[PDB]
Amino acid sequence: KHNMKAFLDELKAENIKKFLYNFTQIPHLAGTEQNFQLAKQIQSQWKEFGLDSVELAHYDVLLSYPNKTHPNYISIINEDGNEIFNTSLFEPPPPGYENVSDIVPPFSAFSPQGMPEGDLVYVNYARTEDFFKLERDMKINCSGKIVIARYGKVFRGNKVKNAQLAGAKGVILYSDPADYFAPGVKSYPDGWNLPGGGVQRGNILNLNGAGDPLTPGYPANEYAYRRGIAEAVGLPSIPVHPIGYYDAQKLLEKMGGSAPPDSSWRGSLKVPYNVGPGFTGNFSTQKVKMHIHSTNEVTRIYNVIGTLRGAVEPDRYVILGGHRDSWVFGGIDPQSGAAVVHEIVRSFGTLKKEGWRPRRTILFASWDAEEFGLLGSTEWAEENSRLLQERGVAYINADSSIEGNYTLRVDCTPLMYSLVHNLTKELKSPDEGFEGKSLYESWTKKSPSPEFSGMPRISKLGSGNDFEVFFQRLGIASGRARYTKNWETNKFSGYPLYHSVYETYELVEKFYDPMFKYHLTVAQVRGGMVFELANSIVLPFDCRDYAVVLRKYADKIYSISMKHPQEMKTYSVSFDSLFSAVKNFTEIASKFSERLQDFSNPIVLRMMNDQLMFLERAFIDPLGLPDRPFYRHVIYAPSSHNKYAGESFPGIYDALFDIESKVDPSKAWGEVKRQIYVAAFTVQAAAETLSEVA
Amino acid sequence: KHNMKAFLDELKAENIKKFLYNFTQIPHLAGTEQNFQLAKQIQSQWKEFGLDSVELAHYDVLLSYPNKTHPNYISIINEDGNEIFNTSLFEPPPPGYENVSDIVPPFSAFSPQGMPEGDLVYVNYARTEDFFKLERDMKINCSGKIVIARYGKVFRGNKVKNAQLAGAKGVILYSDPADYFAPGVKSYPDGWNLPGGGVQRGNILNLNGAGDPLTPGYPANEYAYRRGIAEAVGLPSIPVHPIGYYDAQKLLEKMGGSAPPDSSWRGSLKVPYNVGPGFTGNFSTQKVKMHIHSTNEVTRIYNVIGTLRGAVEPDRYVILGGHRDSWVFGGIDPQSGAAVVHEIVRSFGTLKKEGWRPRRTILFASWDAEEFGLLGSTEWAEENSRLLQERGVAYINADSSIEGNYTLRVDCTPLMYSLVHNLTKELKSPDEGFEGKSLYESWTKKSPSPEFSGMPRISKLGSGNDFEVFFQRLGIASGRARYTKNWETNKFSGYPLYHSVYETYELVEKFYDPMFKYHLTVAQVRGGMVFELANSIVLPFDCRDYAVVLRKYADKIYSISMKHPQEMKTYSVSFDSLFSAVKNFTEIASKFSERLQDFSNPIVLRMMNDQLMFLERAFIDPLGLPDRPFYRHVIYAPSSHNKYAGESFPGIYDALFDIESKVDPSKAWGEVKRQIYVAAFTVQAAAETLSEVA
Ligand SMILES: *[C@@H]1O[C@H](CO)[C@@H](O[C@@H]2O[C@H](CO)[C@@H](O[C@@H]3O[C@H](CO)[C@@H](O)[C@H](O[C@H]4O[C@H](CO)[C@@H](O)[C@H](O)[C@@H]4O)[C@@H]3O)[C@H](O)[C@H]2NC(C)=O)[C@H](O)[C@H]1NC(C)=O
Ligand SMILES: *[C@@H]1O[C@H](CO)[C@@H](O[C@@H]2O[C@H](CO)[C@@H](O[C@@H]3O[C@H](CO)[C@@H](O)[C@H](O[C@H]4O[C@H](CO)[C@@H](O)[C@H](O)[C@@H]4O)[C@@H]3O)[C@H](O)[C@H]2NC(C)=O)[C@H](O)[C@H]1NC(C)=O
Ligand SMILES: *[C@@H]1O[C@H](CO)[C@@H](O[C@@H]2O[C@H](CO)[C@@H](O[C@@H]3O[C@H](CO)[C@@H](O)[C@H](O)[C@@H]3O)[C@H](O)[C@H]2NC(C)=O)[C@H](O)[C@H]1NC(C)=O
Ligand SMILES: *[C@@H]1O[C@H](CO)[C@@H](O[C@@H]2O[C@H](CO)[C@@H](O[C@@H]3O[C@H](CO)[C@@H](O)[C@H](O)[C@@H]3O)[C@H](O)[C@H]2NC(C)=O)[C@H](O)[C@H]1NC(C)=O
Ligand SMILES: *[C@@H]1O[C@H](CO)[C@@H](O[C@@H]2O[C@H](CO)[C@@H](O)[C@H](O)[C@H]2NC(C)=O)[C@H](O)[C@H]1NC(C)=O
Ligand SMILES: *[C@@H]1O[C@H](CO)[C@@H](O[C@@H]2O[C@H](CO)[C@@H](O)[C@H](O)[C@H]2NC(C)=O)[C@H](O)[C@H]1NC(C)=O
Ligand SMILES: *[C@@H]1O[C@H](CO)[C@@H](O[C@@H]2O[C@H](CO)[C@@H](O)[C@H](O)[C@H]2NC(C)=O)[C@H](O)[C@H]1NC(C)=O
Ligand SMILES: *[C@@H]1O[C@H](CO)[C@@H](O[C@@H]2O[C@H](CO)[C@@H](O)[C@H](O)[C@H]2NC(C)=O)[C@H](O)[C@H]1NC(C)=O
Ligand SMILES: *[C@@H]1O[C@H](CO)[C@@H](O[C@@H]2O[C@H](CO)[C@@H](O)[C@H](O)[C@H]2NC(C)=O)[C@H](O)[C@H]1NC(C)=O
Ligand SMILES: *[C@@H]1O[C@H](CO)[C@@H](O[C@@H]2O[C@H](CO)[C@@H](O)[C@H](O)[C@H]2NC(C)=O)[C@H](O)[C@H]1NC(C)=O
Ligand SMILES: O=C(O)CC[C@H](NP(=O)(O)OCc1ccc(-c2ccccc2)cc1)C(=O)O
Ligand SMILES: O=C(O)CC[C@H](NP(=O)(O)OCc1ccc(-c2ccccc2)cc1)C(=O)O
Ligand SMILES: *[C@@H]1O[C@H](CO)[C@@H](O)[C@H](O)[C@H]1NC(C)=O
Ligand SMILES: *[C@@H]1O[C@H](CO)[C@@H](O)[C@H](O)[C@H]1NC(C)=O
Ligand SMILES: *[C@@H]1O[C@H](CO)[C@@H](O)[C@H](O)[C@H]1NC(C)=O
Ligand SMILES: *[C@@H]1O[C@H](CO)[C@@H](O)[C@H](O)[C@H]1NC(C)=O
Ligand SMILES: [Ca+2]
Ligand SMILES: [Ca+2]
Ligand SMILES: [Cl-]
Ligand SMILES: [Cl-]
Ligand SMILES: [Zn+2]
Ligand SMILES: [Zn+2]
Ligand SMILES: [Zn+2]
Ligand SMILES: [Zn+2]
């Protein structure tokens, strides 16, 4: 029998281990020759594995690299202009790798060049609320200052945006032990903690879903017209550089000026965490100087696109995609994900060689340049947007399988909730103490839903990974699942060795997943979801789950607005239309579900499958959200304060955010009402896609 | 047998005559009670006729009306401020109607209020090239002048836009006998010519596809947030008013200043057609004064939406739509079209009562407020855009059936060319001297194709009618057909009595179509097209016809650019990518056609029907054209100089237009190249929708 169980049983932990080892011996930085050779290897193996067609799709996109002969670093400079302390030029390499070539030194991708010199201001996590606290409560002015910020809590691109708007002339990012050093665990190579010389690489763009900065809207193909750099999307205007906590301590220890406002501003280093500006008395004439010489360069990138043609509905696509480029070795990010994709392809291929085909087409993708701003997935989706629009059933992401090893972490559209619950009830938990129990049981126990007893938490999709173009721009039902450390305490900061040279195969094999059983569990969740989406006669989406969350989100946005009852009275701000739309959606969805349960007729089936497939699509507004034309989903968007976090009714949320500070309340409240109208209309329009069609 | 022939034979000229009489006894101005009662009558009759469901869809949109107690008029005013000549306050009513109430006096809908006073400049047809001739060649400055322009050649909204940009402080539009009085035919009521007191009503908006000025993007429903008037879309900034040629002669006869530059500037009145500014010597102290007091008012409008549910593919929609609102009696425009729709519904209904249903759903629409800017169709399409997007097969328009009585006039997507040729070969010509010949024969003889022997001319879709939102915004294959006077000599000006009180039932019955045989022929063309689109197993679209015109349009735009060979060399402007895309489209379309001819398998069929249906959809760019976000089709758009005319590769055309006048040639030629890239990419993307799907 070829069924989901034959598919799942063919997946092997030992294969995933072998592939991870294979993918992590050398760096695979986007745009480099070694990542192109890995692309060719994956292409060859996916063909061997039995896919019908496997092609490279290449694009020429803006990337960023340090200058090999003019290294980036930061100094403390004295009165005379002598540089009395310099930050490191590279991370000390881990045991046995001290001779590996082509390890990119730590840098912030897309930083402009510059050598600014000035006084430091410490801005905590550089969040919106941290700048509010500084400027409004403490009366500290960041204008013309170098800001130093600890990594964590929010996407680092948002930190840089916030610093820029505060008037900073440069940004220094660092990893604080409070966020990247778990109590009682040893530093790499003897445990999974970040050493004092470890540094987190990463891009600091604010693309808002644009993809390659030079070609928003259109694929960066051979004949593409490119914007000039000055009109590029999302580039920071001030130099930025990341450092580790040994170097951070040298920069922070001299800081003077104002005390930190409270303990949420203090990390774990033995320093006061003074906000500044500048250093204490004796050192008041010393300054901090950055030296950034990185260059932005249009560079070729390669996606691998594998097709397994559907037997019955070849014009319906279920996509399993995850990236292949890494900052250095990519032991976790992304190769722990890519090795899982590889074993999934191998398994689907085994069935195919025995004569099976999925009902719908499955596309498999190895995306390039994810780390430089989701460039590979976004360019390919721009190239193929018409096919994806009209044929795209679902997208399942596949980055890092093991953020941690504590429990499952799922984020997806409501349309996939039932599917995820059902599937995880049929999978075995890999967790210690849950042997012979289901994955659903261990997951629900460790990550309970805040609103329902006996259900697990499932979070919202924002961005920070390759599902973004499919879900936020194109409105294709999307999901992701991975093992994680602890949703409660660390959602957005990364595991300690994130984007560092220390994130290696040995890190994984020794400290995360020696038996590869967590990797296997994640392969079964991702592979099983793809299997059901591609093979179930009726698409495995439950529109009623959308109705339930729409109500929750409406209650939520209404409660936010209700912090301002006088203004709601003055400007006649009513949420009645939105509640009415949500009520209608609930009623129509329930009737559609009855019909779906109550119909031999393939046209009715496919008509109904089309209504299911286009339901996510109905939440797209072709005008996009305000000043974010590539975020088109009206129910969800990446948070404007933290690209990693999903926000619900984003148009209304952003219109209400900090509204008491707006100088023209009439205008501001007018925009809140406009967004309520857009949201009510889009919800009712989506509901009406589920009505009888004629 | 229920086949197209049973459908066609049931249509009767006498029914169309009875319905036209019924629809034209009183005015049916948009937003008035009499047009709401007509909507209710049509709703009732379409139900009687046998439609499954017939509903009113209402919206509250910005309309415009004269002030009943403060009439609009124009004066010549002397030195002292005495008004020595006044234009008429109404058209003398035709025989037997001199007691009919609620005839709206001539006015330009959406004119702002004002009473500007100044010297006249005569600007011919107020076209782009007429303002070029005035400002660049003749050195005449329109700033602070009242412009007087003759109607004709281009949409009157473009005239007003051009006058505004030239700095005019008001616009007077008039009907010149050269354009509205055919030699040797009598004036109404004794023939079909415009009398000296006749005046053409009409809106002067520049909406660019927005629909209701207050709610661009979203339907104007009960809870809609409306822009303030100052942010409304498309309103003119200067007063405008239309007059007849008796009144025009009084304004033109005194004109002085410069002679007309040549004979293409002279109409048929006994006046010099001096450009001005101002009057000749003796009258140099006299001025022209406008008095406009019209008001814009949000008003309810009603579409009638009739559904005939498909037997096999109810989730596939073929739409037959045309408007019902008229300026006054609407003898031709639109009731000669609406009476045809009515008989078509009646005929489809007769078959339905005998047990037949079309394969696909047919929707029938009676649109409101077309005359005020396509408001009814556009609001309804905004409300239903998700259903239309994913289910819309085709839209067939149905305004005026008889612009004239000489030959057929068709404008449609290339996808419908074969269908139109095939159908007209099976219909009888109604034309004198072609008895027993096909409609194809008489049409091809009277309106030959400029590029192919033995084929008829079929023109491009622009705007100026209700297909605009379906085709230019949504990318649904669209077509229209009507009898006309003479494409060669009058494409865009209207028949003489257009939008005047004289356009009555008697006009039609006496002077256009006494036997209603032209109306019947048009009913058979429109009804037959709807029948084939709704019933043919394989959609009746030939993608190869698109490949042929894409090449023609590419050759055309390339030849325009090639007027500037030095700049093409300097800025490396290549059309190679576009020709390559068109070549690929041609190759892929040919292979798809072979497969379409070469496949019992309904999924392959519907997969192939979906590829046919989504082909027009693939030409939509979700970013829209530059500064025209509701014109999204990359191959076609309404001309930026004349909304009535279709333009091909509009993005490139507009980037090249008057490019030798641009002050930064580097920037201008950069934009030409950007548009070439967008066009090549969109053509290749559309081609790829026709490739094998996996
Ligand atoms: C959720 O679904 C329900 C349908 O079950 C849908 O109800 C509709 O609501 C609209 C707006 O409230 C109703 O609109 C009315 O329609 C009648 C004609 O049928 C008009 O006469 C009404 O206008 C008068 O009253 C207004 C309100 O005070 C005045 O402002 C106006 O000037 C007129 O005097 C009004 O337009 C519509 O009939 C129902 N349809 C039904 C019950 O079938 C509701 O809109 C959906 N929610 C959303 C957010 O779409
Ligand atoms: C019409 O359809 C044809 C397919 O039949 C399609 O042809 C494609 O054209 C592109 C662009 O010309 C080809 O791109 C090349 O691909 C190879 C790898 O396969 C690259 O090595 C090439 O890059 C090198 O050469 C460039 C050109 O001088 C250099 O600028 C570059 O730096 C590299 O050195 C190049 O990207 C592609 O292979 C074909 N595909 C085929 C033949 O199958 C054509 O693009 C379609 N037209 C449109 C408008 O889409
Ligand atoms: C997740 O699993 C649940 C539980 O198995 C699935 O719900 C069940 O789905 C079946 C199949 O449609 C339902 O059976 C139907 O029952 C009605 C009678 O009530 C009958 O009319 C139909 O012919 C059919 O037998 C069943 O009621 C339903 N059970 C529930 C809701 O408790 C659910 O569909 C799965 N989710 C997926 C696949 O996305
Ligand atoms: C308009 O009318 C023309 C002429 O009738 C239609 O073209 C014809 O379409 C038929 C049906 O597909 C073609 O027949 C096919 O012939 C091939 C052999 O060459 C065979 O493989 C198929 O099984 C089938 O019999 C026919 O060739 C074709 N004739 C032409 C192009 O001259 C055309 O389809 C009509 N357009 C519409 C309906 O939009
Ligand atoms: C990763 O695995 C691949 C596939 O087995 C290895 O590439 C193969 O290497 C052998 C021996 O050098 C060649 O004969 C094959 O042509 C390669 N197959 C390909 C590229 O598909 C590769 O050596 C492994 N890499 C590492 C670092 O272990
Ligand atoms: C990277 O930095 C190097 C080293 O300083 C740069 O190479 C110098 O470039 C200048 C002109 O731009 C030459 O005159 C020097 O002789 C070069 N010096 C050396 C030591 O090679 C190079 O420009 C930078 N690379 C970039 C910007 O991509
Ligand atoms: C930090 O790095 C800088 C740059 O290499 C060092 O300063 C240079 O020192 C050399 C020789 O000692 C001078 O000839 C250069 O002119 C200096 N360059 C600059 C830009 O100042 C500095 O010594 C290092 N500081 C420490 C404490 O190691
Ligand atoms: C146009 O035709 C309609 C439909 O026959 C006429 O409306 C009907 O009039 C009769 C007699 O007054 C009523 O009993 C019916 O209820 C009406 N039917 C409807 C509204 O569906 C209408 O009178 C005709 N109008 C003109 C101007 O001739
Ligand atoms: C249309 O014009 C009439 C007539 O002049 C306007 O009615 C006058 O309005 C003013 C105040 O706006 C009153 O004080 C006058 O007494 C009215 N005069 C008469 C004769 O009724 C009316 O405002 C206009 N209608 C509009 C603008 O919709
Ligand atoms: C054109 O119309 C105007 C407005 O009705 C006429 O001028 C008015 O004449 C009356 C009485 O004769 C005066 O009391 C008003 O003050 C005038 N109004 C204005 C605005 O001037 C004028 O007579 C008409 N001209 C002709 C030739 O008929
Ligand atoms: O440019 C962009 O939008 C994104 C490009 C890139 N995506 P990535 O680094 O491949 O994945 C982001 C990420 C976010 C949070 C965590 C995490 C891990 C463990 C515990 C808690 C949270 C891990 C990873 C980036 O963000 O730099
Ligand atoms: O606002 C808008 O876009 C359009 C609203 C409205 N559409 P309409 O008047 O109902 O139809 C436009 C029209 C254009 C040309 C001709 C014609 C007739 C006979 C011979 C040659 C040409 C007839 C009609 C209008 O244009 O005012
Ligand atoms: C911050 O400092 C600069 C002066 O260097 C000034 O232009 C800016 O207005 C200041 N902002 C505030 C809020 O004081
Ligand atoms: C993985 O799980 C083990 C054993 O349960 C635990 O000791 C270890 O700390 C975990 N690794 C990480 C990175 O959390
Ligand atoms: C037209 O006239 C006004 C002066 O009343 C002036 O502002 C404008 O620049 C003039 N334009 C030209 C081209 O002379
Ligand atoms: C209609 O056709 C007749 C007879 O052929 C012709 O005399 C008349 O002028 C035509 N009417 C119009 C409006 O062209
Ligand atoms: Ca791009
Ligand atoms: Ca609207
Ligand atoms: Cl993931
Ligand atoms: Cl028409
Ligand atoms: Zn990653
Ligand atoms: Zn990463
Ligand atoms: Zn009309
Ligand atoms: Zn009209």
XYZ file of C-alpha atoms and ligand atoms in Angstrom, chain B residues 397-399 480 526, ligand 20:
6
model
C -20.821 44.737 -23.100
C -24.223 45.927 -24.289
C -24.584 49.663 -24.638
C -18.452 44.541 -27.622
C -24.081 39.662 -28.526
Cl -21.279 48.133 -26.353
